[PDB]
Amino acid sequence: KLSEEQQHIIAILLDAHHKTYDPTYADFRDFRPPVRPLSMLPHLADLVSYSIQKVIGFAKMIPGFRDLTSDDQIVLLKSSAIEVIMLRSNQSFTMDDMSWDCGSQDYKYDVTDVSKAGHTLELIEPLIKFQVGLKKLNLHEEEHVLLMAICIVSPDRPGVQDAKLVEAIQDRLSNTLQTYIRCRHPPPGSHQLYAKMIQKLADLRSLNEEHSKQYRSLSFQPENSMKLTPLVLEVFGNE
């Protein structure tokens, strides 16, 4: 069963998520307006930049994350940011029309909008399939936040110094998740759920890879790099 520390961990992550994900998406109005080439780059660049700040806020609240060095926190965030953004976006994703519904029409994104940011189907196609598969899992919010925290605290991220500590932190979360599924997630919805959730992490690595490739390509062009933000440039890379 769920020890007291594990119940604590879940409580902390649930709160952290609630403090970094505003389901009313009220802040989307402060972003440069969407334009429906690469007409969506300014808007999505701001949205992404905003999301990076939110992911960081979540990360810092992950039990143990702070005990990591400055350099390790930085490495973990830079490598996971895009993945957590994709993962957290499953909350706004809807299988009705395969789009992300963030309140209003101006703030509802589809394949077209993402391509209007410069990306191709090489990324978008597997991204939609990912959203669908993750959505099909019908995760409890508890599982959702544990998955994002586990994604951030990954020992194999290149450049990790104290990988041992990173694994220790991640294990604590993994065990919390495995136990939670057994204690709180009822069958059949729990059938191989952990294994399936971990597979989603693997899918995120290839998505991360394809996004990076396309990001380097897009940002290599000064006129596009000009449309980004300082945070996006520092975190995702600056030619």
């Binding site: 960081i56 926190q73 930085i74 300082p230 945070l231 520092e234 975190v235």
Partner: peptide, 10 residues
Amino acid sequence: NHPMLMNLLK
């Protein structure tokens, strides 16, 4: 080397 991220982390 990562000013903004650093600031956001502390």
